[PDB]
Amino acid sequence: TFVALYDYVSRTETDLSFKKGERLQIVNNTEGDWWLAHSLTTGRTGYIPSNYVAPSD
Amino acid sequence: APPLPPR
């Protein structure tokens, strides 16, 4: 899993908003700098900026 | 926060 290093407020419908410290699963990461992620905290799924998260381990 | 990357 990955962990959010910052909060992120959605800027389009298909973005995923998240809070610092939230755990995320990267569902797809082949479409560039924005990755499709699923929040293990909220259950929502959407695109995130890949530089706002880090590997958990 | 870091600059948001291009979409």
Chain A contacts to B (CB-CB under 8 A): 6, 32-34, 49-52
SS3 call for A47: strand
The C-alpha atoms of residue A49 and residue A55 are separated, in whole angstroms, by 14
- For residues A24 and A45, the answer to whether their CB atoms sit within 8 Å is no
Q: Report residue A6: phi and psi, to 5°.
A: -140, 160
Chain B contacts to A (CB-CB under 8 A): 1-2, 4-7
Method: X-ray
The position carrying tokens 């973005």 is: A15
- Indicate the resolution in Å: 0.9
**A34 lies in which domain range?**
1-57
Buried b vs exposed e over A1-18: b needs ≥16 C-beta within 10 Å? ebebeeebeeeeeebbeb
CATH number, position A1: 2.30.30.40
The distance between the two most distant Cα atoms of chain B, rounded to a whole number of Å, is 17
Count how many domains chain A has: 1
Searching chain B, which residue's CA lies closest to the CA of residue A11? B4
